[PDB]
């Protein structure tokens, strides 16, 4: 029989107020980096505390609002660190030999940190994550050489199907395999107690009133209020668990219904051995608005590029900090970048198909012009011209005519694209193209069709994708040509009109 | 008439040997950041340098390769280090405004840089990029909350569609507007010039024989050339280029056939006035193929998150690199993130569909398994359940039949999923269901068909995305049930046959 226990008791005999040359653990520094990386897992650590400027005004925050911006690791979250810890450790029990398969149940981004040590180091890696986890995170791991097996989302832990349980099943039946086990295995906290809370109280000359860190294994928060109460020991910690977890204390907090959130790396339906929930003072629960409300936020406000969990994270910092006046400081963890988040909460009809953004806010932020009609640009009909047209008579007809440009039209009424005076010209004289050639190449082929009856916030998207609209019926005949420039003419002209 | 050509003869007065002193900019030494950003744009410059270990050792080459690795800056690219230094400039000069809108024509990476710049200070921002850049910088800028204008991939820059000609216009139509123009501001080459090569130089101690750099604007490569020849003046110079370019030198590497490529933010179509070619030594030219095969060969070997441009820079230093020899090094510059390319060279279909990928020697790649059919399994019929039974009455009777799981299947024939009896145990222990209580919860409702003829690799990719694949004909009768155990299990029972 074998299977661990993710959710077994801490047997470790740590306890606040004892000499630190107790340890039995192997503990490691933080040493200089060298002038030259002898490989890029020696990018992982020293990662910018950087002010949060304008967000903690906002929400009325009196005191210093400061976020630990994790992303700049070099797999982009912190899993990096705790993947490197955790081979660097193996290696030096002999448990780990060369060319061993590593296998790990991950939310992604400790997969990505592993996958990326191993393609350093050559060790096989296998990734068990949750069906749940975005397919960027699958398209990275891919593109590193790792194997990938998922587990369905609503598998409970204690399930064969869990991605523990897969884990350790493909693990009885591969050879030289190890799991380094993220939830049990020391190296987690411990890489956060020995280096990441020694830079938050260097980068804070050793002063700080308050910590705020989402909970995923409790491996960070965990190593960092352990040093935190011994060198810093009026700092509160603050745990963050989602809507949908059983981590947070009292069991008050976790009564609800809905049993799966959409936020990624955080919360659990069991508690991690590696958790020591009793030197938490505090839990926040937050739910996916608050987190994709806030990481879009801080996107667009302090220009921190991050993920969900950070939200989170955020989302509950305005909230707890409140009791703290001027002068004082709290810092936030932000666990993870957008890079595994591009199609999600980054994507508008993701958010509203989520329901986590509403129609009618985001009207009440849209322009005067936003619910318009295109025909209110007047517009003009263009002049259309045959395929088979040469490059000299396009010209010619388009200068006796006086237009600029013309769709290419055709016999059987298909639109194949544009033609332009500028680009024919340029091309004529730039020996690119002779009179006698045809159009087919000089032609701008890409369009995107329109209604008179479309709004104008609609030609705005558009015009993020594309420069030509075209304005059609359900015949072909085109009724208008809309670019950008045509857009900001009209609202210009009505600034002025006022 | 409003319009200034990016093209311009550089009117700079610089030549080698003058004295430093003599320069009439404005240059601004780098500076040691605080414990404590202020902001994020603080967290641009001081990107590592690193060893490139295994791909310099496979091409043949002797020396040291050494990678500047960019895409670590705020934005993920080299143009957060000249949108800043653009930005500050202007503002110093007193032409930039608190307010004011900042116009750019760029490849995206410029645009990203300014667009942070903006949300951070408050400058409105408009970026005009090409449609054939990814939508991926296009999520990022509009979470940004910049606005976005395109331009025909094709348009000729002498033509008022071409990316610098509608940036021109909507300045015109823009009050308070101004535009930064990296084409021709030599604070890009300046920021180039002042901080990157003095980081290079540092790092290298001084000492260094080769750098290696891909043009588009020619910023980076200038900036780094002249310092690099006042101070390292044995270093070569090398350009990259791609095929459609017309910046290499001499015009017989330009012959080409294809005006356009996939790679995004190299090369043009004119030589910009901050580009000076003469103090480059030697050009090379680069395909999209290359430039694919080396980023992701970086990604899987160094485990270098990078984009394509970084791709065509190396697989030109290793040929550029043949003539040095041990103890000799060569420093290449990477200028950006994986980030802005998550669905293009990262997508194996969209390489397949671009042709930059053959099947044959994928095939050579793959497994022996991988061209079998899913029959050799040998598999097992499931037992089939109504969605309206119980709990209890699953557990009853899959440990009766001896089954561990069973599809969910329908009057209708209609397939809703799979219940396991270790999911319904921990479920009903766990007091989250009844015995009475309906299947819908404890369900897993995701799966994928499959028919007994597929291949086996097309169950690993399905594999990569679900944890169950059902074996289907177009009756809905269930032939097998897989996950990835039981394709596991069967190649190491044919390991263990041979
Ligand atoms: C004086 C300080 C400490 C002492 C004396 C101590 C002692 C121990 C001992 C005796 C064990 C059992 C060894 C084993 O069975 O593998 C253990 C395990 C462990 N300790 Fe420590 N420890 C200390 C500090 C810490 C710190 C600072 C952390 C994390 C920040 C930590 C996390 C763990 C973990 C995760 C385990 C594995 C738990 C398990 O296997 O059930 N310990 N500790
Ligand atoms: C002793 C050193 C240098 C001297 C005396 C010098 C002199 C000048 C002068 C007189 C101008 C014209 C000013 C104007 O019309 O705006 C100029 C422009 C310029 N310089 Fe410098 N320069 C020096 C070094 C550099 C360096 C090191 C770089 C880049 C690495 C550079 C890049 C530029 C650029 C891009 C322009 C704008 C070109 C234009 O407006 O046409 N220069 N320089």
Redesign the interface.
Same mark, same amino acid.
């Given at each position: 029989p074998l299977w661990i226990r993710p959710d077994a008791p801490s047997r470790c005999t740590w306890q606040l107020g004892r000499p630190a040359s107790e340890s039995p653990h192997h503990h490691t520094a933080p040493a200089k +980096?060298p002038? @030259?990386? *002898?490989? @890029?897992?020696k990018?992982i650590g020293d990662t *910018?505390?950087?002010?949060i400027?304008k967000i903690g005004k906002k929400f009325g925050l009196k005191c210093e609002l400061?976020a630990k911006?994790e992303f700049?690791n070099?797999?982009?979250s912190v899993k990096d660190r705790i993947s490197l810890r955790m081979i660097e450790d193996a290696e030096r029990d002999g448990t780990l030999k060369p060319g061993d398969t590593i296998i790990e149940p991950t939310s992604g981004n400790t997969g990505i940190g592993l996958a990326?040590?191993a393609?350093?180091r050559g060790y096989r890696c296998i990734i068990v994550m949750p069906?749940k986890m975005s397919?960027?995170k =699958?398209?990275?791991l891919?593109?590193?050489?790792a194997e @990938? =097996?998922? %587990? *369905? %989302? !609503?598998?409970?832990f $204690? +399930? *064969?199907?869990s991605h523990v349980?897969?884990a350790w099943?493909?693990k009885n039946? @591969?050879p030289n395999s190890h799991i380094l086990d993220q939830y049990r295995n020391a190296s987690n906290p411990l890489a956060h107690y020995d280096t990441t809370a020694d830079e938050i109280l260097?980068?804070? $000359?050793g002063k700080l009133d308050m910590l705020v860190a989402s909970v995923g294994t409790g491996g960070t928060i965990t190593g960092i209020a352990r040093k935190l109460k011994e060198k810093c020991p009026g700092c509160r910690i603050i745990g963050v668990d989602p809507e949908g977890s059983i981590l947070a204390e009292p069991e008050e907090l976790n009564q609800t219904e809905q049993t799966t959130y959409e936020v990624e790396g955080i919360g659990y339906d069991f508690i991690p051995t590696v958790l020591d929930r009793t030197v938490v003072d505090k839990w926040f629960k937050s739910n996916d608005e608050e987190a994709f409300t806030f990481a879009?936020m801080l996107? #667009?406000?302090?220009?921190?590029?991050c993920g969900g969990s950070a939200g989170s994270t955020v989302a509950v910092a305005v909230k707890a900090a409140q009791e703290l006046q001027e002068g004082q400081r709290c810092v936030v963890i932000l666990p993870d +970048?957008?890079?595994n988040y591009?199609t999600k909460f980054?994507?508008d009809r993701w958010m509203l198909q989520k329901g986590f953004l509403k129609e009618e806010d985001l009207t009440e932020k849209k322009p005067w012009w936003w619910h318009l009609r295109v025909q209110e640009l007047g517009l003009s009909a263009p002049l259309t011209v045959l395929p088979t047209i040469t490059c000299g008579h396009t010209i010619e007809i388009l200068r006796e005519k006086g237009f $600029?440009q013309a769709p290419v039209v055709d016999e059987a009424g298909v639109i194949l694209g544009?033609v %332009?005076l500028?680009?024919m010209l340029?091309?004529l004289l #730039?020996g690119?193209v002779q009179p006698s050639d045809q159009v087919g190449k000089?032609i701008?082929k890409?369009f995107k069709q329109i209604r008179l009856t479309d709004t104008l916030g609609r030609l705005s998207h558009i015009?993020?994708? $594309?420069?030509?609209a075209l304005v059609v019926h359900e015949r072909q005949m085109v009724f208008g040509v809309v %670019?950008?420039?045509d857009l900001? !003419?009209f609202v #210009?002209a009505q600034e002025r009109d006022q």
């Open positions: +980096s002038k @030259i990386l *002898p490989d @890029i897992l990018k *910018p505390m950087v002010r400027n400061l911006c700049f070099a797999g982009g990326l040590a393609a350093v069906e397919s960027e =699958v398209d990275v891919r593109a590193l050489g @990938i =097996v998922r %587990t *369905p %989302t !609503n598998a409970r $204690d +399930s *064969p199907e349980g897969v099943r493909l039946e @591969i260097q980068q804070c $000359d879009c996107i #667009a406000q302090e220009g921190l590029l +970048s957008v890079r591009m980054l994507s $600029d544009m %332009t500028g680009n340029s091309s #730039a690119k000089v701008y890409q015009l993020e994708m $594309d420069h030509f %670019t950008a420039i900001l !003419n #210009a």
